[PDB]
Amino acid sequence: LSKDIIKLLNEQVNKEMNSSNLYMSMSSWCYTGSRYSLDGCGTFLFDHAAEEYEHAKKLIVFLNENNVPVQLTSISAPEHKFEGLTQIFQKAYEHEQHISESINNIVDHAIKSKDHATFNFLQWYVSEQHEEEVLFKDILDKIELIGNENHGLYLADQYVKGIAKSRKS
Amino acid sequence: MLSKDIIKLLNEQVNKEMNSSNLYMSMSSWCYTGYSLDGCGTFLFDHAAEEYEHAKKLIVFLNENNVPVQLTSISAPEHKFEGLTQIFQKAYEHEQHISESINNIVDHAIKSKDHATFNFLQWYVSEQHEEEVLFKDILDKIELIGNENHGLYLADQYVKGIAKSRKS
Amino acid sequence: MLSKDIIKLLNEQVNKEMNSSNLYMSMSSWCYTGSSYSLDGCGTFLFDHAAEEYEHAKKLIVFLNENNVPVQLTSISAPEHKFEGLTQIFQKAYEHEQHISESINNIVDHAIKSKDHATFNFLQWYVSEQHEEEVLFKDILDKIELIGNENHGLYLADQYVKGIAKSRK
Amino acid sequence: MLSKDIIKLLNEQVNKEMNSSNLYMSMSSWCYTGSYSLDGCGTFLFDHAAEEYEHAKKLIVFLNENNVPVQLTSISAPEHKFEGLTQIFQKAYEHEQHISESINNIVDHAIKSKDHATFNFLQWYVSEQHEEEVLFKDILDKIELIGNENHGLYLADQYVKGIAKSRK
Amino acid sequence: MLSKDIIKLLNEQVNKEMNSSNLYMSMSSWCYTGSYSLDGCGTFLFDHAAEEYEHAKKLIVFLNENNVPVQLTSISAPEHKFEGLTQIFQKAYEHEQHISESINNIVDHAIKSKDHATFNFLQWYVSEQHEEEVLFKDILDKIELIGNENHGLYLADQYVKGIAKSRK
Amino acid sequence: MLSKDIIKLLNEQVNKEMNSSNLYMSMSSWCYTGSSYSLDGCGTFLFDHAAEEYEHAKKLIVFLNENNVPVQLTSISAPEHKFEGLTQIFQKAYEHEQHISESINNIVDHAIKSKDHATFNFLQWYVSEQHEEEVLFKDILDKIELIGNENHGLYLADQYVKGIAKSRK
Amino acid sequence: MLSKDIIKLLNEQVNKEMNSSNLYMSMSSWCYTGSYSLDGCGTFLFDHAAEEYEHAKKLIVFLNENNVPVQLTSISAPEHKFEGLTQIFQKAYEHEQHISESINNIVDHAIKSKDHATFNFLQWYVSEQHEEEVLFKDILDKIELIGNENHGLYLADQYVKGIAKSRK
Ligand SMILES: [Cl-]
Ligand SMILES: [Cl-]
Ligand SMILES: [Cl-]
Ligand SMILES: [Cl-]
Ligand SMILES: [Cl-]
Ligand SMILES: [Fe+3]
Ligand SMILES: [Fe+3]
């Protein structure tokens, strides 16, 4: 593995751990707010946090198997106060776009350095990340379609609860 | 509902478990690249993942009880270690510290008559105890085998067997 | 052998559970016929919860009989029957469950003080089930508040609770 | 809809069933602790108490489904002191005869007021109550046949234990 | 690791269980040969003796797995002469109450010293011992209910035989 | 009916088996915690052998009860607890098994002399099992001596015994 | 081939078994008709008679297969009058002790004369006879424990009926 690819992979491990924390904090906001219980969204975000940690694990396995040191850096406290349900999913979606871009950057570097084993390895991750980014866009758009007049938050929360349930099953 | 003190201790425990997860990943990586000791490396990786599972279970409990989760900043884990004995000695000491921290929570739950929380924590007391004992056993086996000749190989194979039997 | 204090607290708990069971039957009936819609989802849920409370009473009576302790049943007061609305009924129910949780904690505390470990051990199923019940009532109450009662809110809330009742049996 | 008179009689019947349930729990406890335990009789009476509560529940379902208010009354503290096993079963049997009579009164009323849906619904209850009344008469008579000289109480208790077990 | 005080109490508990096992073997033999054989009671007491040894073994496993030395003491010669069946079950019941109290003492100590892993482990034992104590009370009371006039001893022995058979 | 001598020898054998069981539990504990490594393979093996010795005691008690002979339990002396090393512990255990074999031979011999064939016949399972145990201890002792204690010898020996324990249960 | 002395002892044993079978048939009949029927004891003794004949047959097979002449003697008319149920089982038990002694004598002889094939063959018989002797002692003792006041004979007969049924 090249020096640059090693550095980018280590940074990606750290980004995934940071994402996991961020989504746990968002999950907690859904259940208890900046200090309603939106348990559908809360469950979905918790499960997504756990999935991000699974990505970090898979990257660590790859580093260990390739004999490259894993360099875990300090963990920053995630944001814990959010304005509302739309805003939380808008931040999440933007965050997923940033993660997509960071993976694209690694893949691009693997092509440039002719590291095709690493290119090949990363395909599961490109593909899963894309599905995640699209899923967040879809939920964000559904929250906006439903609206928050009357029982809109309830309907949105039930919609997201359904998505969470179907992705575990 | 939960007392202020119990909430604070539970949040601190979530952070301690995340910190443990990172520490064990760093130890795992030292095993692979610090000689490659893949048996120890796999075992420690799996133990890191298990600590994160403990953090998750605690977060579920907090969410379900409507208590805010406060994830804090954590220092980077130590990454340089002196040798295989020393790494397992540090790990074991760390597990004893985690045991003590859980005992403190359980003690506070008794004092504040929070028996729902006492009851919840029993799986965690039990699993943590099994972990602490397992680390002591591995440490002692590493010392029984010794590092003369192929001792490190035998120790690594022994630990590889433990890792395999605990996933199965 | 059980201490005098523990015997008295266990007997009081039998009587409290019978009282709770009747209270939940009365709440159930309010849902079906209270002064003015039929809320059969909530009505079914509360009926089922009433029956479960009586099962708690029965389990405590079995324990007393098996331990050779006399059961001392007192008069069980007629429950309250008039309620102001759906939110209020679930607010009262939730507060009532919190009171039951406290009363069990008090017994458990006394078992520790008198070193009655057998009784401590017996009571753990009850601590655990009670906590699940208290949380369930908090969740329903919060959902009722999220939905609101503008337009078909009450219908939505009732359908939500109907679904919970069905999934728990 | 159900007539006013029938509604009142049905609610009174619910209350009688709840009252019976409590009385039989108290009788059950006397068997266990009223030394020595009559656990056969104690189990049988406990189970009969539970069955009476099942009847109360069935009646409440019918009221809820018919859109009629359920009006639960206070349940009086039951008798707790009894002179002996014969006397307890004599009281129980007399109590079951009273419950039979109270059901007959409702059914009679349903015929007179032309509430045939209610008449039809109550048939399971007429039938089950009759079986209960007969069962109590049979047990009481068996207790009398066995007698209490020597180990007569033991024999009676074992007989009733057998009945309790076969009915579960 | 386990505290010094808890280690000592746990070892004492092992020894109490071994002592109980021997006492119940002696009581079993009195039933068979203390003419006539009370083989129902004899079988029940033998089986209970074996169960006490199973408790001793479970405790020893816990000590071995926790790296604590097991210190077995001499087991005193048990009482072998008894006045009758009531008296034997009265002694047995009192003995079970003493064992219950000794377990409560350890559990209490575990709470006070914050050894929650040990508290958690001991719950199976608290629960099983309570069932045993109650079972002895029930048998003793049944022996008293049956009496010894005529074939009372036979009836009592057949009752206990039935219990022994259903518990296997 | 059993002779006086046979009754006394059978009672003595009950007490010897209880004493053996305790001795093997103490040896087991030495393996796990003796003054200085954890030898859990040997520890498990010896625990299991202790339990089996107690099963021998139980079978003899059943025979006495069924034959209407009083069981006369004496005090069971505390076992020895300090041992010098792995070789020495298995040397003591093997010698102890040889002594038990002799004590059974003495009973069998007395049964022949008193023409107590029923007792002779009963004792054959015990002669046979004891012989298998004695041989097993000789085999382990010899294996411990073949491996030696230079380097990881103790570890190898402990793994060997662990395998025997596992295959016997 | 079998020695002359062993052949004679084996033939005598066949004859003893045939004689036992007849004696137990007579005892069986006394139970049924010696008013009232003790059919439990009657069935048990009949079945035991049949079992003794099965032992005779097994011994005859061994003699035939070893090429030794079987010499059957006259079977003496058995006792037919007995004083009561205790006395009948006391005679039966004493008879079983005599049969045990006669088997011990043959086995002893086989050791002394070095006929180990015969020693080996006889082990099933030593073992079965011992179980029979013990069973008769147990029944006799139970008859004594129950007593004959009131319905004691009925209880004893039902007890033995149960044994007969479980052994088939
Ligand atoms: Cl930070
Ligand atoms: Cl921070
Ligand atoms: Cl009323
Ligand atoms: Cl001691
Ligand atoms: Cl002859
Ligand atoms: Fe709508
Ligand atoms: Fe009788």
Ligand SMILES: [Fe+3]
């Ligand atoms: Fe080697």
Ligand code: NA
């Ligand atoms: Na992602």
Ligand code: NA
């Ligand atoms: Na841990």
Ligand code: NA
């Ligand atoms: Na209503």
Ligand code: NA
């Ligand atoms: Na409740």
Ligand code: NA
């Ligand atoms: Na009583």
Ligand code: NA
């Ligand atoms: Na319904």
Ligand code: NA
């Ligand atoms: Na009433």
Ligand code: NA
């Ligand atoms: Na009835």
Ligand code: NA
């Ligand atoms: Na006896």
Ligand code: NA
């Ligand atoms: Na173990």
Ligand code: NA
């Ligand atoms: Na002792």
Ligand code: NA
């Ligand atoms: Na016990």
Ligand code: NA
């Ligand atoms: Na050791």
Ligand code: NA
């Ligand atoms: Na042995």
Ligand code: NA
């Ligand atoms: Na007759």
